[PDB]
Amino acid sequence: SLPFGWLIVGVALLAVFQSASKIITLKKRWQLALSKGVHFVCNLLLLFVTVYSHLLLVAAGLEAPFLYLYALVYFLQSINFVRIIMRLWLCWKCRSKNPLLYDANYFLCWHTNCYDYCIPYNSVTSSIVITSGDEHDYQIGGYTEKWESGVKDCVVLHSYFTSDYYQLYSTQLSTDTGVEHVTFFIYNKIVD
Amino acid sequence: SLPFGWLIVGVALLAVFQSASKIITLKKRWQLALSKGVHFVCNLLLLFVTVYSHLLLVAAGLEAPFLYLYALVYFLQSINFVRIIMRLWLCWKCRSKNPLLYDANYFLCWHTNCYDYCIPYNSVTSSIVITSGDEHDYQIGGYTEKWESGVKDCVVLHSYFTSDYYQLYSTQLSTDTGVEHVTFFIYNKIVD
Numbered sequence A, B: 001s002l003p004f005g006w007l008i009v010g011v012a013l014l015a016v017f018q019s020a021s022k023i024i025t026l027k028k029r030w031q032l033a034l035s036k037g038v039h040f041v042c043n044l045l046l047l048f049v050t051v052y053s054h055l056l057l058v059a060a061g062l063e064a065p066f067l068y069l070y071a072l073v074y075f076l077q078s079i080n081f082v083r084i085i086m087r088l089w090l091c092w093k094c095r096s097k098n099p100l101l102y103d104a105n106y107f108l109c110w111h112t113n114c115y116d117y118c119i120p121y122n123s124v125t126s127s128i129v130i131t132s133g134d135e136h137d138y139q140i141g142g143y144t145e146k147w148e149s150g151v152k153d154c155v156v157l158h159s160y161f162t163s164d165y166y167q168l169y170s171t172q173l174s175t176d177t178g179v180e181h182v183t184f185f186i187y188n189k190i191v192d
Helices: A005-021 A029-060 A067-094 B005-021 B029-060 B067-094
Strands: A106-111 A116-121 A127-133 A137-140 A143-146 A154-158 A163-172 A182-189 B106-111 B116-121 B127-133 B137-140 B143-146 B154-158 B163-172 B182-189
Touching: A005 A029, A005 B029, A005 B067, A029 A067, A029 B005, A067 A106, A067 A154, A067 B005, A116 A137, A116 A143, A127 B127, A127 B182, A163 B163, A182 B127, A182 B182, B005 B029, B029 B067, B067 B106, B067 B154, B116 B137, B116 B143
Parallel strands: none
Antiparallel strands: A106 A116, A106 A154, A127 A137, A127 A182, A137 A143, A154 A163, A163 A182, B106 B116, B106 B154, B127 B137, B127 B182, B137 B143, B154 B163, B163 B182
């Protein structure tokens, strides 16, 4: 007494959303969110699908070779949910919406009285270069963000669990490097 | 005369692989490949699943409200395949395996007689900073790569379609910035 067309519609919709998820380019900010939105729906759909599939086996009574598989599926989904919770915790720590949009491992962040800056970053490095200027923008590795306040002497590389501290040593003006309308700030990791 | 348990096994396996795809962290190189490998399998599974589902409708004869949906699915999958082909073309242009592993929009590349360097990059910027040194490594935005040869005066930002040229202006030594065992190279985009 369980419908089948609902299962087929759900799997078709999951295919649609997952296929569209591989088409959205991650260049502009809003598209990023849209991509995540699509992903979210896809994720939900997947859950529904597999959950519904389990119910189908309940009608079939073939749980003997599938209970381990579905336990693994639910365990991995639970780990994914914990990962989303940790992502929200990192968002709260970085007090900006950037961690949800981007998939970077680490986030270079710093606070000002009027704005908070959070930029994606791949791995912990012994030094970090912040490029201002060219409508001033702060960009790291191509990831850019609008300028509203000046830089800070100390910045924090935030992660899921650990956080590192970076201190400014050298500020490079245009007259030093020769690049027009661009200023470089150099930070290095401190040890305590 | 078409099996159903094959469909349920395929959708369960797709759920397993897609759920595991959201667990692999993108920190070390090999994991990256593994992630893509999993993704690849997931993608294939998805195709199979939806393809099989279409065949099921062939048995049902309910193509009236589903032919548009499956045409959209196949169109998006074809666009995804074209995207993979363009990714392989960009890999050949960058003549290294980095573009397959990473998901960056652009790739900063340069050739030497003994090695070719290709580093992920987010967006086209008016300037680029290459950080050498700390076992010397070249790292942009946290994405690091082993050092085997010296830098080049000209580097290329490669994309799916267009390519930009970046020329070196300033090289920052340790004695200038104060950072120990780290050297910074400054490039800017040229106009022709």
